[PDB]
Amino acid sequence: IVGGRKARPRQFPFLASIQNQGRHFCGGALIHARFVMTAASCFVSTVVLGAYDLRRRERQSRQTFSISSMSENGYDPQQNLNDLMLLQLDREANLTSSVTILPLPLQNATVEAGTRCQVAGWGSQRSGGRLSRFPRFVNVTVTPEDQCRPNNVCTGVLTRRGGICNGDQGTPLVCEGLAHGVASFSLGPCGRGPDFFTRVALFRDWIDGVLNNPGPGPA
Ligand SMILES: *[C@@H]1O[C@H](CO)[C@@H](O[C@@H]2O[C@H](CO)[C@@H](O)[C@H](O)[C@H]2NC(C)=O)[C@H](O)[C@H]1NC(C)=O
Ligand SMILES: *[C@@H]1O[C@H](CO)[C@@H](O)[C@H](O)[C@H]1NC(C)=O
Ligand SMILES: [Cl-]
Known part of the structure; x- marks a missing residue:
């Protein structure tokens, strides 16, 4: 930004940090206990919720997930068209003060x-x-x-x-x-x-x- x-x-609190080998490369948002909305353009990545300082463990605040499936609706890279993707998390995120929909x-x-x-x-x-x-x-x-x-x-x-x-x-x-x-x-x-x-x-x-x-x- x-x-x-x-x-x-x-x-x-809905913010997601999408990481590759622990390296943040894209953002996203929790829109459902089991899904994070992000950009299709961004795509073994993990999704990090509840984060504040990328460089800190933040064990009591973070929730980490693997992506079980990805969905898009007619994404077109050449035209940057329909740049939207849904990542299904490995399980439901728990809704806490640091993780909300x-x-x-x-x-x-x-x-x-x-x-x-x-x-x-x-x-x-x-x-x-x-x-x-x-x-x-x-x-x-x-x-x-x-x-x-x-x-x-x-x-x-x-x-x-x-x-x-x-x-x-x-x-x-x-x-x-x-x-x-x-x-x-x-x-x-x-x-x-x-x-x-x-x-x-x-x-x-x-x-x-x-x-x-x-x-x-x-x-
Ligand atoms: C986002 O915009 C809001 C609304 O203008 C900004 O809040 C104002 O900030 C000024 C200067 O600090 C204050 O004098 C006003 O009282 C604020 N309004 C309200 C009632 O909060 C805010 O600072 C902006 N934030 C950034 C990140 O741009
Ligand atoms: C949304 O707008 C499109 C395009 O005008 C229309 O074809 C579709 O029926 C609308 N959807 C609803 C739920 O109103
Ligand atoms: Cl509305």
Whole structure:
């Protein structure tokens, strides 16, 4: 996250740290006791919930999981289309003060331009920079459709540099308490704008289908 502020422990209790061999590479959100929502672009990884400082064990706060299955709905890498993925955890996460579920918008809900949201993550402060050991967050504003695309929800900041960066991909965009977006991409210098998030409301019905039909799918 660029142009943000250090979060306090448990400030964003739904946050997920997706790691590869213990290295954080993407963010996500717990949207169900058994599922974490992230970006398809991000994809033996593990999912870490309840984390604060990436470099600390935090045994009494963290919950770690293996991914039992992954689901996507027409993801297209070339067009950055439908960049959304659901990771089924190896078991149910326990809901604690440090691990909570982030509610979703109803199918087709909208967020008008100018709506205030927040985005939090462990991403870097500049392209190619180091990750942030603590979670950081920034206030963002939904942009005019004209600056975005139907498949996404776009935001910007008032400052010259603020928004997502390396490692924030997959982290949720939270507006009016709901996960309206999934960090997908941003072009040029991080914070320049606008940030592109997959529009979650477009996938509500599909997500529901996944949540209600747990399992690895056809074998
Ligand atoms: C997120 O935006 C909120 C809303 O403007 C910011 O909160 C304000 O901060 C200023 C300066 O610290 C205060 O004078 C106001 O009282 C605050 N408003 C409320 C009632 O909290 C907040 O600091 C922004 N956070 C970041 C990460 O941008
Ligand atoms: C959501 O909008 C699409 C596209 O306009 C429409 O075809 C679909 O029926 C809507 N879903 C519901 C639940 O309203
Ligand atoms: Cl809604």
